[PDB]
Amino acid sequence: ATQNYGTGRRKTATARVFLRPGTGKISINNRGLDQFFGRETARMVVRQPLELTETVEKFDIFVTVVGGGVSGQAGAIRHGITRALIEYDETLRSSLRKAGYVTRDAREVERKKVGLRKARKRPQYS
Amino acid sequence: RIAGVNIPDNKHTVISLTIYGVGRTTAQSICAATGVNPAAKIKDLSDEQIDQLRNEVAKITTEGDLRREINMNIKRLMDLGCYRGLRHRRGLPVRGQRTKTNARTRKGP
Amino acid sequence: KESMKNRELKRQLTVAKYAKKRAELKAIIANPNSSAEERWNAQVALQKQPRDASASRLRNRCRLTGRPHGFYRKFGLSRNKLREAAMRGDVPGLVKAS
Amino acid sequence: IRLKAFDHRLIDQSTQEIVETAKRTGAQVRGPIPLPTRKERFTVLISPHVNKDARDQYEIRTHKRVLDIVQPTDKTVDALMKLDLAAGVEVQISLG
Amino acid sequence: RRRVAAKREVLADPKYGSQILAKFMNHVMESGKKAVAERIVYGALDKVKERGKADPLETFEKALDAIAPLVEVKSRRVGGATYQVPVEVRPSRRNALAMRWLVDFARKRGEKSMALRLAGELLDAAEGKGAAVKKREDVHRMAEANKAFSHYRF
Amino acid sequence: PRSLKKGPFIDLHLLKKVEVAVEKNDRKPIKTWSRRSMILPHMVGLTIAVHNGRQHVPVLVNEDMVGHKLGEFAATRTYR
RNA sequence: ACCUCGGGUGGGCACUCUAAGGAGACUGCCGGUGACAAACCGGAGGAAGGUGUCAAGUCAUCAUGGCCCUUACGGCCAGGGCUACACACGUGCUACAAUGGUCGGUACAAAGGGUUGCCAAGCCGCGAGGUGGAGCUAAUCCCAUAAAACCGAUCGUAGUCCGGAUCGCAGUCUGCAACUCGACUGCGUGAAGUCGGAAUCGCUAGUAAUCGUGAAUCAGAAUGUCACGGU
């Protein structure tokens, strides 16, 4: 069927999309997007691929992804919009290079260095 | 007399008591069950709900009565040859703080 | 020094020399079941009964060198061993990873 | 079955002698349940002069495995308790 | 000496529909909280026009008229007096001084509504009678004694 | 800390020339071999000298003392 | 299915719970420059593509000298006398009183070492979780409570109702060792924080940048470089 497995990841996650076709319905983390979130702007940043792939009338999206911070896996809703849909078809394949929202940025907080203050935040010298 | 010292207006009623030093979490039940409303000032309401908020002045310690024993116990430490008056004769921290030199707000001039 | 490394090392058998009166006198003090006349009976305990019965003057060191700093809970050895032990292979499981 | 073993290389070679030698005797033993790397960072000094800018990294690993026997009668857990070590493996056993 | 960096502007605003305004949460983010920033990123743009009569993208765009300079203030040596460099420059220079200094006068007003004390200056550029417009006309007539130094001794 | 979880002071070996010396008159100073050693709250007005190794100090004790160490008659660091 | 919709539990091996170890990331390729050549400029795919040095700190943590204490630093229960404030400062979180002056509240941290240890909901509480003890070998838990959000109150812009430096006295916890000095911040009091200018610590990309450490030779106040600064 359309009973698939996609995964968005920010801060070492393992996600669950219970995806099916429909008409533009969004939900996240056993909640709605108007239910867990609100008092932010990061909800409809994901609108930017969503309205340009014209899937606002075709799919039902429920990407549970947990962990991180307040607006940290608000950076994971960035990723998991088209992963479990390009495993269906190949229409929007080359039409998503303009956005560029899949690469898990490895410029996060890596290994801990002594002598410095943080990863590569340098201390006071003379 | 009204809160001991003459009081500037245009500020809060519980904080008119919570005037530098013993209060709010002990007066948490005083201003809430006497009926005296925190929501308005000491004057603009009825002028009658201060009468028990003025009696607390002369029961334990007063602005005049804190000056009474401000020299008795210090006289107990200066000429008895002791160490609470060895760093009072000098002027250091007494209760074992950051000890000798380069201390922020304990020595003064 | 010679009269130092063999006079505080003997605290293994002198601090717990008694070792049976030292536990029969130090638990029911933490119990409030003692009566108001009985503040004194539990205080004939350990001091004039010669006073190597407390443990406020012992320190943890290395064995072959005797360095007190660099001592951890996972060894009986110190900071000048770890560079020269597991490369000759004196320590198990100490392997470099990330 | 629970052990108390060292690392990656002395339990992944110690459980190979367990499950196949317990399946030979007509019994049913389940497969290996994983356990990742025991993350703990260690910091010591290495400089001959006393120096605060010099620390480093170390680790000791600790890896154990969850197993269980469905019909408990196995001599693989008691007689092959002396086989499943080589130099310093200490095989704990559980009758599960 | 080679320029190795690649200019990557990322502009996609969730509700506001701007063109050049979207990613600006950098000095509105005062190393703190985003939920504190929610009435002042766009909620202050929903607070500019509430006493006015337009759309808040009307007044924002026209900051590239009279608080944007004409010449540049970088210092250069020949063998003598250190000459600055007046020239007609591409918009990335002069309009860089038309957005970030317009908000930089926000502490000497100190009024009610934290949301209003950031964006209570943007509507003053309709005639251009605010705070950043005074220094832009200072630039042009402190460039008379320099304007011939572009090829000769520059 | 240092509250009155420890109410009394029943110390037996710091005692046997103190509590017995009530019936005997006060003509000699009770010398002490520690910087720690204390005595009863019902004997108030004895003399204890600060014990460290070179010379002794004037020690004056009145009726109203309840709190802490003997470290005030001679100081901790006596300003050499 | 059920649930108190916290999952008692079979089933969760596929629409998974933090992977031991792994094809791993390109001079790979076409084209214009250059002697065609090192490179340097540009395009792939695809919500991933070009990275042997500076007469100086230790004859003292293993070492090693010219003289020494030689009824002795082979004796040790040691009869206390190392901060007059009289300065420059290596200066290096914290604010500029207005986002305005005082709390017990939010979708909410939560596991390991744990056979002389870590020390429940506490009965104690405004805030003290000594007798208690769910956890005694921890997909368990003791600090187990918490996240800078909504519109937070009266009043709407202050060297002061942020202000307490000697006068907490004194309150059944190591337990033979708290006789003019300690956590327990309850805020009645006793201040010096007003665009950083003389000139200089020093910021070209994950950066200039304000949420904390749990555990011993088996007794828990190891602070400028703190297991995650969600910007």
- Give the pair of three-digit tokens for residue C85: 């032990």
Element (H, E) at D17: helix D16-23
C80 three-state secondary structure: coil
Residues of F in contact with C47 (CB under 8 A): 11, 13
Where residue B105 sits, what CATH number does that domain have? 4.10.910.10
Local structure of residue E58 (DSSP, 8 states): H
Q: Which positions ≥6 away from F13 have C-beta within 8 Å? A: C47, C48
Amino acid at E104: D
CB < 8 Å & 24+ apart, contacts of B12-20: B12/B38, B13/B37, B13/B38, B13/B39, B13/B40, B13/B41, B13/B42, B14/B38, B16/B42, B17/B53
- The CATH code for residues D1-96 is 3.30.70.600
Q: Which positions ≥6 away from A103 have C-beta within 8 Å? A: none
- Supply φ then ψ for residue D16, to 5 degrees: -75, -30
Q: Which positions ≥6 away from E69 have C-beta within 8 Å? A: E94, E97, E136, E139, E140
Residue B10 and residue B51 in one domain: yes
Element (H, E) at E84: strand E83-84
* Distance from C-alpha of C79 to C-alpha of D46, rounded to nearest angstrom: 8
- Give the pair of three-digit tokens for residue E3: 């320029």
The closest of E96, E101, E118 to E109, measured between CA atoms, is E118
Are A4 and A84 within 8 A, CB to CB? yes
Please name the residue ranges forming H helices in chain B.
Answer: 14-17, 30-33, 72-78
Query: How buried is D58 (Cβ within 10 angstroms: 0-12 exposed, 13-18 middle, 19+ buried)?
Result: middle
Q: Which residue has the tokens 């100190």?
A: E110
Other C-beta atoms lying within 10 Å of the C-beta of residue E144: 9
Interatomic CA–C1' length for residue D93 and nucleotide G10, angstroms: 26
The residue count for chain D: 96
Q: Which residue has the tokens 């925190």?
A: B38
* Distance from C-alpha of A70 to C-alpha of A40, rounded to nearest angstrom: 10
- Helix (H), strand (E), coil (C) string for chain A: CCCCCCCCCCCCCCCEECCEECCCEEEECCECCCCCCCCCCCCCCCHHHHCCCCCCCCEEEEEECCCCCCCCCCCCCCCCCCCCCCCCCCCCCHHHCCCCCCCCCCCCCCCCCCCCCCCCCCCCCC
User: Is any atom of nucleic acid chain G found less than 7 Å from the CB of residue C82?
Assistant: no
Phi-psi region of A5 (alpha: psi -120 to 50; beta: other; left: phi over 0): beta
* Distance from C-alpha of A77 to C-alpha of A40, rounded to nearest angstrom: 13
Amino acid at E52: G
Check E14 against A44: CB less than 8 A apart: yes
Query: A–D contact (≥3 CB pairs within 8 Å)?
Result: yes
Element (H, E) at E75: strand E75-76
Nearest nucleotide from residue A113 CA, by C1' atom: G225
Amino acid at B5: V
Please name the residue ranges forming H helices in chain E.
Answer: 45-48, 56-61, 91-94, 134-140
Tally the domains of chain F. 1
- Gyration radius of chain F over CA positions: 14
Residues of A in contact with E15 (CB under 8 A): 41, 44
- Give the pair of three-digit tokens for residue F2: 């240092």
E76 three-state secondary structure: strand
Q: Which positions ≥6 away from E64 have C-beta within 8 Å? A: E91, E95, E98
Interatomic CA–C1' length for residue E131 and nucleotide G205, angstroms: 32
The residue count for chain B: 109
The closest of E64, E70, E62 to E139, measured between CA atoms, is E70
Q: Which positions ≥6 away from D73 have C-beta within 8 Å? A: D27
* Distance from C-alpha of E120 to C-alpha of E44, rounded to nearest angstrom: 9
Q: Which positions ≥6 away from D56 have C-beta within 8 Å? A: A114, D43, D44, D46
* Distance from C-alpha of E56 to C-alpha of E126, rounded to nearest angstrom: 12
* Distance from C-alpha of B45 to C-alpha of D38, rounded to nearest angstrom: 67
- Supply φ then ψ for residue C84, to 5 degrees: -115, 20
Best mutation site among F50, F72, F76, F77 for testing chain B: the one with the most B CBs within 10 Å? F72
Tally the domains of chain C. 1
Fold of the E19-149 domain: Ribosomal Protein S7 (1.10.455)
- Give the pair of three-digit tokens for residue A18: 């219970």
* Distance from C-alpha of E30 to C-alpha of F48, rounded to nearest angstrom: 63
Distance from CA of B28 to the nearest CA of F (A): 27
The residue count for chain E: 154
Are A73 and A42 within 8 A, CB to CB? no
Residue B79 and residue B49 in one domain: no
Residue-wise DSSP of D18-70: HHHHHHTTT--B--PBP-------B-----SS--SS----B-B-----B--BS
* Distance from C-alpha of A66 to C-alpha of D59, rounded to nearest angstrom: 29
The closest of C63, C64, C60 to C73, measured between CA atoms, is C60
Other C-beta atoms lying within 10 Å of the C-beta of residue A79: 23
Check D58 against C98: CB less than 8 A apart: no
Q: How many Å is the maximal CA-CA distance in chain D?
A: 65
Q: Which positions ≥6 away from D35 have C-beta within 8 Å? A: D63, D64, D65, D66
Contact positions of strand G to protein Cβ (< 7 A): 14-21, 40-41, 45-49, 57, 61-62, 74-75, 77-87, 89, 91-92, 96, 98-99, 101-104, 107, 116, 126-127, 130-131, 138-139, 147-151, 153-158, 160-184, 186-192, 195, 201-202, 204-211, 216-217, 219, 225, 227-231
- Supply φ then ψ for residue D18, to 5 degrees: -90, -55
Q: List the domain boundaries for chain D.
A: 1-96
**Cα C59 to the chain's mean position, in Å?**
7
* Distance from C-alpha of D61 to C-alpha of D43, rounded to nearest angstrom: 15
User: Is any atom of nucleic acid chain G found less than 7 Å from the CB of residue A12?
Assistant: yes
User: Is any atom of nucleic acid chain G found less than 7 Å from the CB of residue F45?
Assistant: no
**Cα D36 to the chain's mean position, in Å?**
11
The residue count for chain A: 126
Q: Domain span at residue F30?
A: 1-80
Residues 29-88 of A with CB under 8 A from E: 39-45, 47-48, 70-71
F71: nearest CA partner in chain B: B83
* Distance from C-alpha of F13 to C-alpha of F34, rounded to nearest angstrom: 13
Are F18 and F34 within 8 A, CB to CB? no
Are F8 and C41 within 8 A, CB to CB? no
Please name every residue paired with A27 in a beta bridge, in sequence order, or none if there are none: A62
Interatomic CA–C1' length for residue D94 and nucleotide G219, angstroms: 34
- Give the pair of three-digit tokens for residue A26: 């969004």
Q: What share of chain F is helix, strand, coil (3-state, %, to 5)?
A: 5, 0, 95
Task: For strand G, list residues 48-87 of chain B whose Cβ lies within 7 Å of it.
Answer: 60-61, 63, 66, 69-70, 73-74, 76-77, 80-87
- How many alpha carbons fall within 13 Å on the CB side of residue A118? 4
Q: Domain span at residue B79?
A: 69-109
- Helix (H), strand (E), coil (C) string for A93-116: CHHHCCCCCCCCCCCCCCCCCCCC
Instruction: State how far the alpha carbon of C37 is from the alpha carbons of C33, C34, C42, C61, E35, in Å.
Output: 12, 8, 11, 45, 64
Give the neighbours of chain B: at least 3 Cβ pairs within 8 Å: F
Please name every residue paired with D25 in a beta bridge, in sequence order, or none if there are none: none
Please name every residue paired with D33 in a beta bridge, in sequence order, or none if there are none: D66
* Distance from C-alpha of A68 to C-alpha of A108, rounded to nearest angstrom: 12
Residues of D in contact with A112 (CB under 8 A): 41
Task: For strand G, list residues 80-119 of chain A whose Cβ lies within 7 Å of it.
Answer: 80-83, 86, 93-94, 96-97, 99-103, 105, 107-109, 114-119
Are B88 and F72 within 8 A, CB to CB? no
Q: Which positions ≥6 away from E5 have C-beta within 8 Å? A: none
Domains, chain A, in order of start with CATH, read 1-126 (3.30.230.10)
* Distance from C-alpha of E72 to C-alpha of E143, rounded to nearest angstrom: 9
- Resolution (Å) of this entry: 2.9
Parallel, antiparallel or unpaired: strands A59-64 and A25-27: parallel
* Method used experimentally: cryo-EM
